Amino acid sequence: SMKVANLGAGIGALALLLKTQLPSGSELSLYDIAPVTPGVAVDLSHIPTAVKIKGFSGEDATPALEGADVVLISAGVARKPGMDRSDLFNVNAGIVKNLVQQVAKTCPKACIGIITNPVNTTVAIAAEVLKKAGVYDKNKLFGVTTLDIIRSNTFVAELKGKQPGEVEVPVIGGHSGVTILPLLSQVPGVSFTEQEVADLTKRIQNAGTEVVEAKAGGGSATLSMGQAAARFGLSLVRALQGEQGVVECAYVEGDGQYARFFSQPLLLGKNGVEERKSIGTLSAFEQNALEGMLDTLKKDIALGEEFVNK
Amino acid sequence: SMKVANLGAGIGALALLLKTQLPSGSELSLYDIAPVTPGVAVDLSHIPTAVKIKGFSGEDATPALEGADVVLISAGVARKPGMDRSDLFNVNAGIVKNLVQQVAKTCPKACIGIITNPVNTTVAIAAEVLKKAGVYDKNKLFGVTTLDIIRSNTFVAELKGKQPGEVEVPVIGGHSGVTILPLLSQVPGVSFTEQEVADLTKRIQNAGTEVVEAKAGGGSATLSMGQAAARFGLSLVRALQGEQGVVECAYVEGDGQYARFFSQPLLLGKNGVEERKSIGTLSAFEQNALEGMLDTLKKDIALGEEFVNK
């Protein structure tokens, strides 16, 4: 039986998906500073699935974290391309630090998925916090990049007339702008012109903008983010329960060949990362894009390390 | 082959469930006065399922309605415990009238599910509008009472230690207070003491209050409502596509034995209601509750009829 804790439950799109899709016998806790959160859980408790759900508010996440196997951290303010980002970094960084300290004290053996942006940096914050607490397990800390994958699947399927559900695009690197690297060259049976590669890559890297613009500045990609986080969360749960062949791309502390943290295909298992898989063969376009974004990625990482260690 | 229009999409909980659960090849339109609505659709469009989704704002629902086979109307303000009923009515009545007139003009052959409260009254509004337009088909107009059913299922499964997914409680009558009549006497394999019947019935008739109170007045049962409406909507779509044995309780214009509109078990089919099923044998408690609700139910209905016919 598995327990998932969602810190920063917000409006509860992620919570809704977990309540309806977690296996029978699971438990789900929701925590958010918003005082409505216990009632968000009560709302969901009326849905007749065999998933016990409880909600918590105030400043202490500990009750939601007790016995958690998976912790999904989506607290903070949501990424919104075009928003004046004044103060947003310092705010989310402080939130992640605070929440991960509580995880370290309460459920240090949990798999931890950082959704809170910017993921490239916030994962590094989390790692440093866990290290300072002496409980860091590189195999159990993930930046959730799944949104980039599902966006790529949708766009590729649309361009090439495939069933959206049957397309699976590997996406490596990081979770922001030029650090997002969709491996279009690896999609079987489909071939792209150089122009299509260039156009699709940019669309995927700036997909959030389509949403913000269609909302006339009024919001962001909250529902698809929820869906993406649910996919990742459920993959972790299946793997932790012993299902085999569970593969997801995610941002983890790997061998450090490209950067300290880097998103690559991962076989998940009973202890988190079972195997970090090869990124495979890259086209020239891909190899160049990879090299081109390393300076930005390394800076993102350094920024997070400094937040905790300086 | 099936298009669902959700008028009053709000935050998009219902939209999310439809986007992820509608059969491949479906279409989904969202309409809401909130200017972010086109972008709520764009957000959902990034999820790789074979359901085309488009969103609309402004004052005209027509674009969302073109070619719709199912129309789910959840526009207006949400009902809350202790709220002035005149305020609810004075907002929602005019909204339902306006929206249903547009349905009558654009997609008169659609199945129409009224979620907007108070359902007992708003369905009668809808019927009168459809009649005035000369397109009323009593087999295609439904008040969505499914939330009462899934609440009953959850509470019964908890009390009796049953698998929540295996409990199905028939709920008849209407959608508010004493008009909500769970037929606990008909639940296979389980038996209830008179006290349990009385307690469960009361809990089901006031369930929304649990949520509002746990939210300290800060909101209502939006997520479970979404789930309930998704269940109903998917049942309609499956029946319209020719799936057999699809049974749901809903508030429809029937034989008039109890009231002009009444919620009873319905076999759904290719033209909406295939068969109105008899309510079966009632316990003494149920027979008394049924008689006790008729004055309230008939008044709810009359209020809606008069709103359009005066």
Q: What is the distance between the alpha carbons of residues B75 and B94, in angstroms, rounded to a whole number?
A: 11
DSSP secondary structure string, B263-282? EEEEEEETTEEEEE------
Q: Are strands A27-31 and A52-56 parallel, antiparallel or unpaired?
A: parallel
CA A225 to chain centre: 9
A25: left (phi over 0), alpha (psi -120 to 50) or beta: left
- A12 close to B (CB below 8 A): yes
Q: What is the distance between the alpha carbons of residues B31 and B277, in angstroms, rounded to a whole number?
A: 34
Contact present, A76 and A216 (Cβ < 8 Å): no
The answer to whether A92 is annotated as binding is yes
DSSP secondary structure string, A268-308? EETTEEEEEPP-----HHHHHHHHHHHHHHHHHHHHHHHHH
Cβ of A39 within 8 Å of Cβ of B213? The answer is: yes
10 Å CB burial of residue A213 (0-12, 13-18, 19+) is middle
Q: Could you count the other beta carbons within 10 Å of the beta carbon of residue B166?
A: 12
The domain spans of chain B are 1-144, 145-310
B43 closest CB neighbour out of A43, A157, A223: A223
10 Å CB burial of residue B162 (0-12, 13-18, 19+) is middle
Q: What is the distance between the alpha carbons of residues B25 and B202, in angstroms, rounded to a whole number?
A: 42
List, in sequence order, the alpha helices (H) in B55-109. Answer: 62-65, 85-106
Contact present, A223 and A16 (Cβ < 8 Å): no
A47 closest CB neighbour out of B20, B214, B227: B227
Q: Which two tokens stand for residue A194?
A: 């150089």
* Data resolution in angstroms: 2.0
Contact present, B177 and B82 (Cβ < 8 Å): no
Instruction: Please report, for residues A177, A279, B236, the alpha-carbon distance to residue A296 in angstroms, rounded to integers and kept in the order given.
Output: 10, 20, 51
Cβ of B214 within 8 Å of Cβ of A38? The answer is: yes
Would you report the helix, strand and coil content of chain A in percent, each value rounded to 5? Answer: 45, 15, 35
A154 closest CB neighbour out of B11, B47, B150: B47
Q: What is the distance between the alpha carbons of residues A30 and B47, in angstroms, rounded to a whole number?
A: 24
Closest by alpha carbon to B150, among B129, B161, B164? B164
Half-sphere exposure in the Cβ direction for A280 (13 Å, CA): 17
Cβ of A47 within 8 Å of Cβ of B163? The answer is: no
Task: Spell out which residues of chain A touch residue B16, defining contact as CB-CB under 8 Å.
Answer: 13, 16-17, 223, 226-227
CA A134 to chain centre: 24
Task: Spell out which residues of chain A touch residue B212, defining contact as CB-CB under 8 Å.
Answer: 39
List, in sequence order, the alpha helices (H) in B46-163. Answer: 62-65, 85-106, 119-132, 146-160
